Design a protein around this ligand. Structure first.
Ligand code: CLA
Ligand code: CLA
Ligand code: CLA
Ligand code: CLA
Ligand code: CLA
Ligand code: CLA
Ligand code: CLA
Ligand SMILES: CCCCCCCCCCCCCCCCCC(=O)OC[C@H](CO[C@@H]1O[C@H](CO)[C@H](O)[C@H](O)[C@H]1O)OC(=O)CCCCCCCCCCCCCCCCC
Ligand SMILES: CCCCCCCCCCCCCCCC(=O)OC[C@H](COP(=O)(O)OC[C@@H](O)CO)OC(=O)CCCCCCCCCCCCCCC
Ligand SMILES: CC1=C(/C=C/C(C)=C/C=C/C(C)=C/C=C/C=C(C)/C=C/C=C(C)/C=C/C2=C(C)CCCC2(C)C)C(C)(C)CCC1
Ligand SMILES: CC1=C(C/C=C(\C)CCC[C@H](C)CCC[C@H](C)CCCC(C)C)C(=O)c2ccccc2C1=O
Ligand code: SF4
Lengths: 73, 73, 123, 80, 89, 142, 740, 40
């Protein structure tokens, strides 16, 4: 979740541009192509995606502790 | 006395998380930096690098930020 | 984009043109059985020597070729849905067409599973 | 495509025009300013939403406004 | 040079090395201030920026008597210790 | 002024080539073609990456993004004080004179330009979103 | 073309008038403050000489003078260390019993009960156990009293005053002209021979006259306060002759080329001293002697004012081939008219050198009683690794700065510089693919081992007990260097280090150096390092290549190096600049270096460090690295959680300072996530409400309070993030290794 | 000296001075009156 919050849309976008070039140039793979143009996660989108990862962690990490420490004894 | 400190810490989370959400709610459609926030809707990335920085200026980002404080509380 | 010694050596620009995908002319099904067997025969390998039952007696090769067959079938479904989600308007190379892909997919499914059987008959 | 609107609060500075990276704004003649000019947005089909023009608008608030909306290959600036 | 080593193989080797290397620059068989070299190891001459003034007929300058003798000294030391390490010396 | 017509046989600047130019979009979607007229053969920086020697007189370079062409346009208009013009070649061959599309570079006022997207009210005189709710129309546009 | 000293008399005047005018350096910040941003700007733009003026003469004079001050503060720091190690230290007590006495050279004042920090380091002294390795450094320098430390301290302070004086003199008085600075052939000729060569030869003098006899007597059991003082070895030939009979001949063997006679103070023993556990001082003296002749000769390569010599410009141009177009022709000017280009190349090699030094010093402890001081070893290895990792990141940053500020498309036509900017999407694309591969094929075989272990299938894991992946290549290089002395290097009496193989050096019942064995877990952790190193390079290299332009924003050069984003359009263009590729390449550097220091901390405690008992050695952790490091849980249960006991229980003891710092570090690291995860928009408006309250009570500040800039918040967060994490490990490591 | 005193008045210098005095005062107070838990 941190990556989607610490890092922002731009380094990924330009990186996706390089990936698009490589695939179009790669032989035997250029045959298969994407129907939708690959783009980086939206500015607001990444905010919610990172936050969902961040929240899910805080829940699973604690649920594990709260249950395995209480049960273990 | 151990409960005294933690109880006041819980209050800090309640007041802060509240401040984040309340600030976003009151400034949802108004603000010196973005006086036309209502015209830009609720979920918009930013108003650009103009006026120094408009990063996380939407009332969606008071929620996005309040979530972290809620989890901390 | 920048003609390099690698992406131009007439030897390698010719090797590519004999591979059953750049060999436009062969019927898309026959360009699918070729590719299918090639990608299918080597598949069993990784499952036979490093799979869950790799150290069991006799059932280490049946289980590798059974698992391979599984993936082969999975690969087929992805090939099919790809054509359905790429040839909505049935877009030269007939392989790059709606019917072309549906015959390539079938050639691959019947060539790869034939290759997986060749590898078990080679153990 | 993003929506660009020029409000009457324009001084015809032409700065927003000399700032657009995709020729979306131009200077047309008007009578409500002493510079007898008011930026128009003829081709908002090439707007990328950079908001460079706003960073160049000197009038109180913003005479030029870019409302980021629908996204296309041009709007997303995709060379794919 | 000490303990009257004069005459010792080491003395002869060092003297020979220093001389053979000073007579490899005074006699144009190697790079020198003026008559340098090239990317193919060929002396293509050279302009020195100080413009050293030498009385030596060939133009051998002090810079070149302290730059070829030093090579001879290093060469001699390498040969002396090398033969010394082996049975040669 | 008459919208210049593209001469697709215009000498192109000298450049070895770069893994940073046109892709499938150029053919499947569209591409753009900037053209200018130099005074001498000079090295310029490509808006795609690298350096290129512009040829004397007519020059023609193709890009897959309008900003790329306009970038080179400003570079020539400033570094070389040239007057570059670019079009948009669609896959069918339909060339559309993109810049300046008037003869007078946008910044300069010229009679004969209509006012488009021009609200005649203070940005703070826009209605409330509730007045345009369920209307599918923006407060600014309304 | 003449190489000569060129100076301009009394250029800058020495006055405090400019001192009273904050921002006199920048045209923009000279107009005074109106917002609270100017405060943060006058600091974020004070060393950027290139921004202050366009003259490369002034920028260089400023850089040259600045370096002087740096040296000055370095001297002050060094002098303070000697002084603190002279008055407030137990160095002399440690000298008598180096093994059982812990080094200490920091005493805290008796106040606020902070006197608890003054722990019993032994030797009638209550202070703070230092981990800087200075005591063992002084011992190997011969220092046997606190009068030789006091004198050194005074000398360092005198040097400091000379450095600052030189900086002011070479700036306000005799300021060198540009033509002086751009004599690279001269600099290299004088820095290789005069600086490095003479610097080593001068040391080979001390080591041969003061450090060798003093250390021999100390290792012989002689009391430190009974050894003849250093000068007596120089003057009294008899004393030195007794210790080294070769001083009976004199300098005759050297001139007679009979160097062999000196084979008692100049030897190629190899290995570690059996008494002190550190490289023989005799071998170090021979090394510095050789290193010197090499550098001194190397100083006679580039051409200066006479004729003999090479021309770096000609050499670079001469090196061109059938694939790299014009070749290196055009880099000489770049590297003689740019400080950012030079700095980038310098930092990269300098930073990498720091890591290389850390690996060599720990593998071959160079100081006496250093290897048995586990805290010093760990603290040094972790330190240099970071100091270096930071430099490398700076190398990437300045490289990008030069590309966006000093790159000229005209000078670089078919250079290997234009031919790389012209295939950036092949370099980056391939590096991206290898990163993803290394990622799955290094961190995946760890999650696989985790899942297979949890599912109760521990025979289906990647370990030396199951599916093994031994580092055979590393295991062969270890044997080629252990059997090297008997074949490849006969003259060497022993291998370079015990790490390659052999017996275990024990000093005082502890393992100084023990042969390290590489297993599956070593293979796994090493490939993990490669993946991180590759990723870090990808981020920084990507920033350098696209520092000027990219498919997204084809004019970044005209935007700058430190620009936040082009705009919210194009689907978002945040962190497109090369400063934001350095911003992110810092977190990965922390991630990459963190695993390395953890790998060293655990491997050593498990396979090297311990007590040599009758028949066997007791390692700090009982040799559990092999089976416990193939999973991520083992790195948390047997490393983080298990070794964290000392720091979490340091309260109430001399180590209580580390427990406090350990938590304080967590707070700083977490506090950084308010600037790395948020945005000015929220803070700016929040400040508006606060200002309202202030304006109501009529207490509003004249300067307009403004939230931090987008780039500033990115810098503040990364700074606190790195400070917090490194501080946490510093407390962890130090309290763990000092307690055990 | 007018301009040196101006520099010694700048925010960073004045804050460094004010704090040092305040810090030293608290340190000296505890030095003579240690363990001040209650005002008695
Ligand atoms: C009659 C001529 C002569 C002879 C017989 C020798 C003989 C010898 N030399 Mg020597 N040398 C000579 C001339 C000669 N040298 C001259 C003219 C020079 C000046 C350039 C040198 C400079 C020189 C050096 C610097 C060294 C020798 C060394 C040696 C000894 C081992 C060489 C070796 O295997 O290195 C090793 C071979 C390797 C592949 C290892 C080196 C690889 C590193 C990493 C590079 C050997 C007995 C070496 C020595 O002293 O050994 C004790 C050594 O250090 N010589
Ligand atoms: C919370 C109240 C408090 C107070 C009032 C003090 C006060 C003091 N501490 Mg202390 N300390 C505290 C808490 C406190 N501390 C805590 C909680 C810890 C545990 C982390 C420490 C750990 C600590 C250490 C390790 C040391 C001090 C030291 C000092 C003294 C000088 C500070 C210093 O060295 O700066 C540094 C001053 C300079 C570097 C000179 C400045 C020259 C410029 C910068 C150039 C000072 C009287 C030092 C001391 O005891 O002096 C002998 C010292 O060694 N403290
Ligand atoms: C890189 C070379 C180098 C370095 C780093 C050192 C470093 C050191 N030396 Mg040293 N020394 C060197 C070369 C070097 N030496 C050489 C080549 C000689 C002659 C063989 C000496 C002879 C020497 C003696 C006799 C002593 C030292 C001492 C010292 C230590 C303290 C000196 C001090 O700072 O107080 C004082 C500084 C000065 C008095 C400045 C004067 C130095 C002279 C004028 C410079 C040239 C002298 C030389 C004879 C010519 C110190 C760690 C002292 C010590 O106790 O050792 C641990 C000491 O007694 N050195
Ligand atoms: C000692 C008397 C003295 C005086 C009166 C001056 C006066 C002046 N100098 Mg100067 N300088 C001096 C000594 C002096 N200098 C020395 C010894 C050096 C060598 C390092 C320099 C190097 C130097 C450079 C390179 C430049 C000046 C410049 C200037 C002029 C404006 C900048 C300035 O100084 O404002 C005040 C600046 C400060 C108060 C900053 C102090 C920085 C000092 C050197 C060290 C601080 C480092 C600090 C301890 C780092 C750790 C911080 C940490 C503990 C938190 C000004 C008239 C600038 C100029 O020429 O005008 C454009 C210029 O670029 N000086
Ligand atoms: C034998 C000649 C010689 C020597 C020994 C040095 C040594 C050094 N030079 Mg240098 N240089 C030389 C010739 C030499 N230079 C020539 C001929 C030129 C012109 C082409 C330059 C141009 C040059 C530049 C532009 C710079 C250096 C720098 C440095 C320092 C590197 C920084 C460092 O690591 O600090 C380590 C500190 C030490 C090792 C302690 C030694 C410090 C002494 C006092 C330096 C004395 C050097 C000087 C030549 C001696 C004469 C001084 C006399 C006039 C009073 C270093 C000490 C850098 C620098 O200034 O850093 C501050 C740097 O910016 N040099
Ligand atoms: C010899 C090494 C060297 C040199 C000479 C320079 C020189 C320069 N760098 Mg630089 N840099 C280096 C190494 C170096 N760097 C390394 C290794 C890194 C990687 C981290 C960087 C990363 C870096 C960045 C990101 C930037 C520069 C920039 C600059 C330029 C201006 C810096 C400035 O504004 O000053 C001002 C100095 C400061 C504001 C100090 C910063 C505050 C400090 C670092 C935080 C405190 C840290 C410390 C641990 C705190 C202790 C605790 C605290 C409570 C006291 C300047 C020419 C800037 C630039 O030119 O961009 C256009 C720029 O943005 N550098
Ligand atoms: C735990 C947090 C985390 C994780 C897992 C990653 C993971 C990754 N980062 Mg990243 N990063 C993080 C935090 C994290 N990051 C943070 C906080 C920052 C801010 C500083 C960054 C900044 C950053 C940058 C700048 C870059 C990366 C990059 C990468 C990728 C490197 C390429 C690779 O090795 O692929 C291998 C994949 C892995 C290592 C993930 C392992 C997951 C397992 C193996 C997958 C198994 C799934 C299995 C089939 C089950 C499927 C079930 C089904 C229902 C889906 C990689 C996937 C680089 C990149 O994009 O690629 C080049 C890069 O550019 N990161
Ligand atoms: C501490 C004392 C520093 C010297 C001082 O205060 O006066 C220092 C005085 C006045 O210091 C400054 O001088 C500059 C002009 O030379 C400034 O422009 C101002 O006039 C003055 O503030 O000047 C000196 O005598 C130089 C002393 C250098 C030490
Ligand atoms: C790698 C070793 C390259 C071996 C090597 O050095 O080749 C040598 C060759 C150098 O050719 P030239 O004779 O033209 O070069 C001479 C002058 O440039 C000076 O040497 O490199 C190239 O042809 C350029 C292509 C390098 C870029 C492609 C290499 C991709 C690998 C990237 C690194 C990961 C592996
Ligand atoms: C015939 C003639 C002449 C003569 C001249 C001469 C006399 C010459 C010689 C010269 C010389 C006389 C030369 C030599 C040189 C040498 C040197 C100068 C040395 C050097 C040294 C070095 C370089 C170093 C070495 C080293 C050491 C020290 C240590 C170890 C290592 C080594 C070995 C390396 C005359 C004029 C008279 C007359 C006329 C003619
Ligand atoms: C907290 C936060 C702030 C607020 C940060 C501020 C206001 C910095 C605080 C600095 C101090 C505390 C304010 C005043 C500084 C003065 C120099 C202190 C003088 C006070 C006396 C005691 C000396 C941002 O501005 C910001 C911007 C962009 C992204 C994230 C963030 C962010 O997370
Ligand atoms: S960096 Fe900030 S202002 Fe710029 S696009 Fe991103 S969120 Fe908006």
């Amino acid at each position: 979740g941190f990556m989607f919050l610490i890092s922002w849309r731009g380094y990924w976008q330009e990186l996706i541009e390089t990936l698009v070039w490589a695939h179009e140039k790669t032989p035997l793979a250029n045959l298969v192509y994407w129907k939708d143009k690959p783009v980086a996660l939206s500015i607001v989108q990444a905010r919610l995606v990172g936050l969902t990862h961040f929240s899910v962690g805080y829940v699973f990490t604690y649920a594990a502790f709260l249950i395995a420490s209480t049960s273990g004894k | 006395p151990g409960d005294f400190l933690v109880h006041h810490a819980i209050a800090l989370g309640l007041h802060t998380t509240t401040l984040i959400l309340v600030k976003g709610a009151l400034d949802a459609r108004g603000s010196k930096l973005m006086p036309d926030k209502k015209d830009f809707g609720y979920s918009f990335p930013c108003d650009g690098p103009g006026r120094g920085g408009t990063c996380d200026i939407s009332a969606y980002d008071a929620f996005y930020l309040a979530v972290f404080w809620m989890l901390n509380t | 984009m920048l003609e390099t010694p690698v992406t131009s050596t007439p030897e390698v620009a010719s090797y590519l043109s004999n591979l059953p995908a750049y060999r436009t002319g062969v019927a898309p099904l026959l360009r699918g059985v070729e590719i299918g067997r090639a990608h299918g025969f080597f598949l069993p390998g990784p499952f036979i020597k490093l799979g869950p039952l790799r150290n069991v007696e006799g059932a280490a090769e049946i289980a590798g070729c059974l698992s391979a067959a599984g993936l082969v079938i999975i690969l087929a479904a992805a090939l099919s849905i790809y054509g359905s989600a790429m040839f909505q308007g049935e877009p030269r190379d007939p392989l790059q067409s709606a019917e072309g892909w549906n015959e390539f997919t079938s050639g691959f499914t019947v060539g790869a599973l034939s290759g997986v059987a060749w590898a078990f008959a080679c153990t | 495509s993003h929506i660009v609107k020029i409000y009457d609060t324009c001084i015809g500075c032409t700065q927003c025009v000399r700032a657009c990276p995709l020729d979306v704004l131009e200077m047309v003649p008007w009578n409500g300013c002493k510079a007898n000019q008011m930026a128009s947005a003829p081709r908002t089909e090439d707007c990328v939403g950079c908001k460079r023009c706003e960073t160049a608008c000197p009038t109180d608030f913003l005479s030029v406004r870019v409302y980021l909306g629908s996204e296309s290959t041009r709007s997303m600036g995709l060379s794919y | 040079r000490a303990d009257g080593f004069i005459g010792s193989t080491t003395n002869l080797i060092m003297v020979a090395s220093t001389a053979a290397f000073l007579a490899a620059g005074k006699f144009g068989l190697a790079p020198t201030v003026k008559r340098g070299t090239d990317a193919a190891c060929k002396l293509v001459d050279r302009p020195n920026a100080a413009g050293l003034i030498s009385n030596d007929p060939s133009g051998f300058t002090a810079v070149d008597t302290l730059a070829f003798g030093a090579l001879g000294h290093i060469a001699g030391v390498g040969i002396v210790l090398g033969l010394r390490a082996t049975g040669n010396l | 002024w008459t919208e210049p017509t593209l001469n697709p046989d215009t000498p192109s600047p000298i450049f070895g080539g770069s893994t940073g130019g046109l892709l499938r979009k150029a053919q499947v979607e569209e591409f753009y073609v900037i053209t200018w007229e130099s005074n001498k053969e000079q090295i310029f920086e490509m808006p795609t990456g690298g350096a290129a020697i512009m040829r004397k007189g007519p020059n023609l370079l193709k890009f897959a993004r309008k900003e790329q062409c306009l970038a080179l346009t400003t570079q020539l208009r400033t570094k070389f004080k040239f007057t570059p013009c670019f079009y948009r070649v669609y896959p069918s061959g339909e060339v559309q004179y993109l810049h300046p599309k008037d003869g007078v570079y946008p910044e300069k006022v010229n009679a004969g330009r209509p006012g488009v997207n021009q609200n005649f009210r203070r940005i703070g005189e826009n209605v409330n979103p509730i007045k345009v709710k369920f209307t599918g129309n923006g407060t600014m546009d309304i | 073309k003449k190489v000569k000293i060129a100076v301009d008399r009394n250029p800058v005047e020495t006055s405090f008038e400019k001192w009273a005018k904050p921002g006199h350096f920048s045209r923009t910040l000279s107009k005074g403050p109106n917002t609270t941003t100017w405060i943060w700007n006058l600091h974020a733009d004070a060393h950027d000489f290139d921004s202050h003026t366009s003259d490369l003469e002034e920028i260089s004079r400023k850089v040259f003078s600045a370096h002087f001050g740096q040296l000055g503060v370095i001297f002050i720091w060094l002098s303070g260390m000697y002084f603190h190690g002279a008055r407030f230290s137990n160095y002399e007590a440690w000298l008598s019993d180096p093994v059982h006495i812990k080094p200490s050279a920091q005493v805290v004042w008796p106040v606020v009960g902070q006197e608890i920090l003054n722990g019993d380091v032994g030797g009638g002294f209550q202070g703070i156990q230092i981990t800087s390795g200075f005591f063992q450094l002084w011992r190997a320098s011969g220092i046997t009293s606190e009068l030789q430390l006091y004198t050194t301290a005074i000398g360092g302070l005198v040097m400091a005053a000379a450095m600052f004086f030189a900086g002011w003199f070479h700036y306000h008085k005799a300021a060198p002209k540009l033509e002086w600075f751009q004599n690279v052939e001269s600099m290299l000729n004088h820095h290789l021979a005069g600086l490095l060569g003479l610097g080593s030869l001068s040391w080979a003098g001390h080591q041969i006259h003061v450090s060798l006899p003093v250390n021999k007597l100390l290792d012989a059991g002689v009391d430190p306060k009974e050894i003849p003082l250093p000068h007596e070895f120089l003057l009294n030939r008899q004393i030195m002759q007794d210790l080294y009979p070769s001083f009976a001949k004199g300098l005759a063997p050297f001139f007679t080329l009979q160097w062999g006679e000196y084979s008692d103070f100049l030897t190629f023993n190899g290995g570690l001293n059996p008494v002190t556990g550190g490289l023989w001082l005799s071998d170090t003296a021979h090394h510095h002697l050789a290193i010197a002749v090499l550098f001194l000769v190397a100083g006679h390569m580039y051409r200066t004012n006479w004729g003999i010599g090479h021309s770096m410009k000609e050499i670079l141009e001469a090196h061109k081939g059938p694939f790299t177009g014009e070749g290196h022709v055009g880099l000489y000017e770049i590297l003689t008219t740019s400080w950012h280009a030079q700095l980038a190349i310098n930092l990269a090699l300098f930073g990498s050198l720091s890591i290389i030094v850390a690996h060599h010093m720990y593998s071959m402890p160079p100081y006496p009683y250093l290897a048995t001081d586990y805290g010093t070893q760990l603290s040094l290895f972790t330190h240099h690794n970071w100091i270096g990792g930071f430099c490398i990141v700076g190398a990437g940053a300045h490289a990008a700065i030069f590309m966006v500020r000093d790159y000229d498309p005209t000078n670089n036509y078919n250079n290997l510089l234009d031919r790389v900017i012209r295939h950036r999407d092949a370099i980056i694309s391939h590096l991206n693919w290898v990163c993803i591969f290394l990622g799955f094929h290094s961190f995946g075989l760890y999650i696989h081992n985790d899942t297979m272990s949890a599912l109760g299938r521990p025979q289906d894991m990647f370990s030396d007990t199951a599916i093994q992946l031994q580092p055979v290549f590393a295991q062969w290089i270890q044997k080629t260097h252990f059997l090297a002395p008997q074949l490849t290097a006969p003259t060497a009496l022993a291998a370079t280090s015990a790490t390659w193989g052999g017996d275990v050096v024990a000093v005082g019942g502890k393992v100084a150096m023990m042969p390290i064995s590489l297993g599956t877990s070593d293979f796994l952790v090493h490939h993990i390092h490669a993946f991180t190193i590759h990723v870090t390079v990808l981020i920084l290299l990507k920033g350098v290549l696209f520092a000027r332009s990219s498919r997204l924003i084809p004019d970044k050069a005209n935007l700058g190096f430190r620009f936040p984003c082009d705009g919210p359009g194009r689907g978002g263009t945040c962190q497109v600049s090369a400063w934001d590729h350095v911003f992110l390449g810092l977190f990965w550097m922390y991630n990459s270096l963190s695993i390395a220091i953890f790998h060293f901390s655990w491997k050593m405690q498990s396979d090297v460090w311990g007590t040599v008992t009758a028949s066997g050695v007791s390692h700090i952790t009982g040799g559990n690295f092999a089976q416990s490091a193939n999973t991520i849980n083992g790195w948390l249960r047997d490393f983080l959680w298990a070794q964290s006991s000392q720091v979490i229980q340091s309260y109430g003891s001399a180590l209580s300072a580390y427990g406090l710092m350990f938590l304080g570090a967590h707070f700083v690291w977490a506090f950084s996530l308010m600037f790395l995860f948020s945005g000015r928009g929220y803070w700016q408006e929040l400040i508006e409400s606060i200002i309202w309250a202030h304006s109501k009570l009529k207490v509003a500040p004249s300067i307009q309070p403004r939230a931090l800039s987008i780039t500033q918040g990115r810098a503040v967060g990364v700074a606190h993030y790195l400070l917090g994490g490194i501080a946490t490990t510093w407390s962890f490591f130090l309290a763990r290794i000092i307690a055990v | 000296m007018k301009n040196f005193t101006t520099y010694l008045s700048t925010a960073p210098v004045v804050a460094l001075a004010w704090f040092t005095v305040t810090a030293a005062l608290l340190i000296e107070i505890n030095r003579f009156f240690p363990d001040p838990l209650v005002f008695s």
